[PDB]
Structure formats: C-alpha cells, structure tokens
Design a protein around this ligand. Structure first.
Ligand SMILES: [Zn+2]
Ligand SMILES: [Zn+2]
Ligand SMILES: [Zn+2]
Ligand SMILES: [Zn+2]
Lengths: 374, 374
C-alpha cells in the first residue's frame, strides 16, 4: 500500500535525531516527528500500513558508487568473466542505489551491456546509475563520446573507472586526462548530474600526480577528480589524505576482511582519517562488487563501530557523502522530501529491513523481493 | 507539503465514478473514496493540504501524442522556424504529458534538440517523451538507428512523425517502411515502451496503402502502425475508419476551428465515429502544437460536448486511449496507483486547475508555475 508509518525508530539521518515516527508516501519521506502511537487517528479510507520498530536504528540506504553490475573479471582469461550481480546481492547488503561501471575488460563488454543492466535493475526496484567510458583510452561509450553519453543517457553520471598509475592502464597523458575531465564537468553543468571522473588507482609510484597537476595548473574544480582504491597501498593513502585539502572526494575500497594486502583495511583507513581530523565529508566507501561483494560495506561499518567509532561518524561515508559528490539531491538522508531508501539495523548492526523507493525488499530479516533469475 | 486531499470531486476517470474524495500522495493517486459529510481527523503531524471543489468535474490530464516541442515550421523559408513551445502552452491547455517530434524540417533540427527539450520540460514538471526518426528517410536519430535510440534513450518511445502519402515525404518504399516498423516493434519489446511508428499522412491518393499492405502481408501487429492527421481529407478518414477493424489506433488532428476544410473538423469526425458504432477505444486526438496550439484539444472537446456527446465518450480520446497505445501504464486514468496528472473543469468545460505529477500548475484560474523563459 502507498503510505507506511514507521513508528518508534532511532534515526541516524545520518546525523542522530533520536526516536521518531516516519511517514512514507509512495517513494518519498513525507514526515518525521516525535514518537506517538495510540493517540494518532488514521482515516479508515486511507491505505496506511503501520509498523512498530521498537526503537531500532534507521539509516539511509547505502549508495555504492563502484559496482561491476554486469560482472567484472576477465583479467585471468575468458573463463574469469564474472556473471551479472543479482538484485539481492545489493539490496541484502543495504545497497539501495548502485552506480555501475566497466573496469579492466572494456574490450569484450560494452556500455550497451552496462546501461541495459542499469535499466534492468531499475525495473526490479533498485535505483541505478552508471559511469561511461571505462578503464582505457580511447573510451568505451554508446554514442562515441563521453560528453554525448552523459548529456543524452539519463543514468550516465560521469566517466569511470578510468585507470591511472596502473600496469593495466592506457598510460594516459595529462592532456588526455584534462580533456576527459572537461567533458564530464561540462556535461554535468548541462545535465545537473555528477560530472565527475572516477579514477581507478593502481600501485604505481606516480600515484595521484596527474590529478594534482590538473588541479594546480587548470581551472577544473577539484571535485571533478574522484580517485578510488585509495587505501590499496600506504603511500597512496597518504597522498590521498593530502589531496583532501584541495577539495576532492576520495573513495576507499571495502576489501574483504584480511585482504588489504600491502595497504590499509578500510576500517583502519577510516580510523586514521578520524584521528587526523581530515574533512570526513569528503571521504566515501565503495564495494567494487562483482569486480568484491557489496556485503563488505556493512562489514566495514561494523568493524569501524567495533573500534569505538560512532555510527554518525562513519555512516555518512556510505550515504550522504556519496550523494553530495554524485549530486543525488534526493538520496543519502532521512529527511523530508528525500527518497524513501532506508535500512533498519539491529543492535549488532545487522541489516534486518531494506526499503528502496518505498517498497520493502527485505523485512524482518526475510527476502521480500528477488531478481528475475535469482 | 506532499499529501493533497481533493474533496468533493465529480470524477470522470474517464469512466464516470460519481462524487468522490481523492488522496494524492506525492506524484501518485493514493485513494479514491465516497465523499461523506463529516470532515475526518487528519493527524496534525502529517503535511496534508485539503481542498474542497464543490462537485466540480475532475478528469485525467490530457496526453498529447503529437507536438513540435522545439517548434516546427520551416516550410516557407528559414524565417518560419517556430520557437520552442512554452510550458504553459501545454499545462494551461490541460496537457500534462507531451510526446515531441520533428516534422518536415529534420534537416536543420536534430534529435539532440528534441530530446534536450524533452528533458527541459521534465525539469519544469511536465511529463515528456519523444518520437525519434522524424519525417524523412534516412532517419534523423542520435545513435544512428531507431532501434538503438528507442532501446537506450529512455524518453524515446517510437518513430515519428514518418511521412507517407505526402508531396514532402521521402517516397518511402514498402520494404523501407516494414523495416522501420520492425525496428520500433522489437525495441518496444526490449524496453516495454510503445514500439509504434507514428505516420504523418498527407493528401496523397495512395492514402494508407503501405500500412494496409504491411498488416496484410507481414506478421507485424496492427497496433504498430499509428496514422495521424486522418481527418485531413474525407477519403483518408473513410480509409482510416476501415483500418480500425484491423486493430490500429488512428489519430485525429485538432485543427483550429476555422480550418479543416477539405477534410473534417475533429469534432465532426468524432461525432461520425460515435454514430457509426466504431471502436472508440482506438481513436485519439492530438494538437500538432508548434507545427498549431494545444488549446485546440480543449476546444474540440467543448465542441463535441455541444453536439450532445457525453464527456465519458470523448474524454478517452485525450487520455486513456492514448495511454493504451503508447503503453503509458501509469497515465490516462484516475485510479489508485496512477500518476497524479489531473484537471478540474467548470460546468462550461473550461479548465480551472491543472495538476502534473502532484504539483499544481494552474489553480483557481491562476498560473502557479510558468516556464523558465515565459
Ligand atoms: Zn578499479
Ligand atoms: Zn572496479
Ligand atoms: Zn504531420
Ligand atoms: Zn506534426
């Protein structure tokens, strides 16, 4: 039914509001107000469903800016192509918005594949967007240019994951990179969309040089440049922390626990950023799912809380911080007028309930909706 | 506010429902129920606006399937290119959904212009779609084929307005036409969209021969072939009425009252269809606005009600019959779950209030929203 009243929820918006009741109307958050119960009169003719959550934590849904929705892989032979990621692999991990991309294999996979799968996820109830262009130069696009792709394909928000400082990159020049950045930036103005270039970083010692030079030498705003994997090695993390001062958002990768290799686990990188007093609103977390599994997002969250960080310190990294850089004006907050994408968590931060666009995909820890072929 | 309660409305859905109360929740119709005498208590914390209409007629918004949103013209020199049609030219005529197209001038105007303007009108709060391809062959498209424009550009729903039996046509062959129809039909299957070819008819004596042949000789469903301007001359209208038996929707043009003269005024054609016991669900009316003004849709409606036809007979031709052929599953009806696209009319059938996606564009005879540059 179309109106859902969520009573007695302890809201992290991500900022803590305390105990509230929330009215959902269709796919939107319509009201948030101090908790009552028996003293409210609901008209009998209105289709309202009332759920009492007994003070459970409610958070916005996670926005995963980096997922290989078509499947990634292929770097160890053709048998290593990962199949497309099922709906429930996102929704059950608390992901209510996904941004898809191609990675190393933009030779056998196409943007048509990517965008098709965005529409398919949208048809199944998930919010979904994608990055055009891919990993290599020349770019992989539908229309022949990034500029035209971002302008005319509504779900295309920018260029990604474009590779720098990696043995698998195209060895892009400074001139190539700043031209791509101009394209996405301008397309963002034309469209109101993110207008960012999301960079895959490898383990090359040149690290962020290209981005540092772009911001120092050119007029392109620093927010256009969005490096990911920045916790993959320690010198790179250190340089990424410095780049915050310029105004970039940086994206950590939620590596499977015990896998962060010679870099930092994401929970440790976040602990470091907190201690250092870095601008936390500029830091985000993504899964690399399909490339990775989206459940590492919540695992990283719980590992952080386990260190003694507060939910409101870390939760923006999965929600409002992502929506700010990606210009998703209606996502990432539990606030009136925003989309009804929300999670309920129990006291050990397991996600028990998942709502996407006002529809339950998981409720009382049970699957309500699964993908067509799951 | 995000909930609006429309009280004491006489609903034509288009089917007559009698007097009701209607709850709008964001952009959707959430409840429709019997108008009682006692005012109901609405919880004070919920942002609900209540509005009383004293029994006024409420209808779905008009869906205009044929408008030159960029402007048309150009057929008498370059100074005849019409400027883009303002937002209010649609809303104030009761048009809450428009489908744009290019016409004779697909040489100086592009699908990029068209689709840009679709997104513009959506940003201003109109629902808007477009036809790709245009008038001539080879087609005008963004991606270089209709099939790929329909598959990957969300707002693109089919091919139009493709000219047959007209001195300005490309003199298309049967093989050309059926291949186009194949493209749009399959793209409709892939996407769920209309998957139709909307044909501009001229005054050529060959009339609908190419369509008739396609239906007779091939497996293409009749609903694929959607001729417009079928009232423009009398023999064409006679042939278009026969095409209803094959299962095609046919589209009448709401010519300005002075002016249909070799053919039939749209109100006279509608009256003939009713009298002749034709399948009225298969007949639509569009404005050719920009090409033409959307206010002729209302004018036609009023002219047919003055002949003594009923509002429930004619109103589907502006609303549900259009939604049916174009596969707009959430438009065209005042029913729970459909989009909150609604008109209120006075007893002279003048449009006093216009709601698009739950937002008022006209209220009590006053403009509430205008276009950016109107
Ligand atoms: Zn990567
Ligand atoms: Zn990746
Ligand atoms: Zn025409
Ligand atoms: Zn026209």
């Amino acid at each position: 039914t179309m109106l859902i009243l969520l009573c007695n929820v302890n809201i992290y918006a991500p900022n803590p509001l305390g105990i509230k009741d929330v009215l959902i109307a269709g796919n939107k958050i319509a009201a948030i107000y101090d908790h009552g119960q028996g003293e409210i009169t609901i008209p009998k003719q209105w289709p309202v469903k009332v759920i009492n959550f007994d003070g459970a934590i409610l958070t916005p849904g996670f926005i995963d800016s980096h997922a290989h929705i078509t499947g990634g892989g292929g770097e160890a032979g053709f048998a290593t192509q990962v199949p497309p990621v099922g709906l429930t692999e996102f929704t059950h991990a608390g992901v209510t918005t996904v941004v898809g991309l191609l990675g190393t294999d933009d030779t056998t996979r196409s943007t048509e594949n990517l965008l098709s799968r965005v529409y398919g996820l949208r048809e199944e109830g998930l919010s979904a967007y994608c990055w055009t262009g891919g990993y290599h130069f020349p770019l992989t696009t539908i229309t022949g240019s990034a500029k035209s792709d971002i302008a005319f394909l509504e779900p295309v928000i920018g260029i990604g994951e474009f590779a720098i400082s990696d043995h698998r990159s195209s060895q892009p020049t400074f001139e190539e990179v700043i031209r791509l950045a101009s394209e996405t930036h301008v397309a963002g103005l034309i469209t109101g969309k993110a207008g960012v270039i999301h960079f895959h970083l490898g383990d090359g010692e040149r690290r962020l040089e290209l981005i540092e030079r772009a911001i120092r030498e050119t007029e392109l705003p620093a927010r256009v440049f969005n490096p990911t994997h920045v916790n993959r090695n320690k010198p790179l993390f250190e340089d990424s922390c410095k780049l915050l001062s310029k105004g970039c958002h940086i994206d950590l990768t939620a590596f499977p626990a015990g896998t962060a290799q010679p870099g930092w686990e994401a929970c440790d990188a976040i602990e470091m950023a907190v201690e250092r007093q870095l601008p936390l609103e500029q830091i985000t977390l993504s899964s690399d799912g399909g490339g990775g599994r989206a459940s590492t997002l919540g695992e990283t969250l719980v590992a952080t809380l386990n260190k003694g960080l507060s939910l409101e310190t870390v939760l923006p990294m999965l929600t409002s911080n992502v929506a700010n850089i990606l210009r998703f004006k209606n996502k990432g907050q539990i606030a009136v007028g925003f989309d009804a994408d929300l999670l309920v968590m129990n006291e050990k931060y397991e996600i028990t309930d998942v709502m996407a666009q006002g529809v339950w995909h998981k409720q009382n820890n049970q699957t309500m909706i699964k993908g067509t072929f799951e």
